[PDB]
């Protein structure tokens, strides 16, 4: 889902995948509904789209 219909990294990707798992900042008690994603999409996304 995250690869095909959200944001694709290329097959010959040269770069670092720097990411931290934060629970203090981006979590609201009741739900941060601002952050959003897609489940259904009729096209597999090419990289950097």
């Amino acid at each position, epitope marked *: 889902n995250i690869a095909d219909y959200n944001y694709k990294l290329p097959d010959d990707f040269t770069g670092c995948v720097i990411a931290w798992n934060s629970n*203090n*900042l981006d*979590s609201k*008690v*009741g739900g941060n509904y*601002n952050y959003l994603y897609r489940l259904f999409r009729k096209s597999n996304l090419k990289p950097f789209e």
Partner: antibody
Amino acid sequence: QVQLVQSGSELKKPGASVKVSCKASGYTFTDYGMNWVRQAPGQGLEWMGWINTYSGEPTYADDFRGRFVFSLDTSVSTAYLQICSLKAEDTAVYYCARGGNWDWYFDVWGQGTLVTVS
Amino acid sequence: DIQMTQSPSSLSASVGDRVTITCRASQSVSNFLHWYQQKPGKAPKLLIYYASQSISGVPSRFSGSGSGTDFTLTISSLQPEDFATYYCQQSNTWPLTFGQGTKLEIK
């Protein structure tokens, strides 16, 4: 009406540990954050850290990472700060602030705990 | 880390005039800045949030505008009972930085 009462003017030794109060009323206490700022009389406001209102984790600012401890007591809407091992340079007031996780503006209303140390 | 400055430091004003105070940021805070007012011996209160919009429940003698690194508000009708130290507050990057202050004084 939303207002945040505070404790009286503390006056203790350089080396004791006291606990100021910030009691909340009127709004949803579990919605927003509970930031704290301090103000020296020869200086201005400095952001010093916030706490989440359901877990109570005390994340601090990058400058004062040490002796300061926030303690949350839920379902009473009290937001106590616990300063420990006071020094001679800590003769500053401490203001209470409601600053949420999404909007992050302070709006400091707080009467001012006159922490005089000698 | 934002060196947040404001000019002029101490300016005077009279009754019912149109004053303009500006406040400048080193880095881009493009649409997130808040304006505060602080009387001596009194806790502050929000005036203008996000540099354009205003809170309900404030006297609307003033309005705010600005983007980029240049931010201001214009008090279109000043009254002598203000005499207060005005503060800016951005909302873009940690740590959160205030301004030094523009204290208004009567002649």
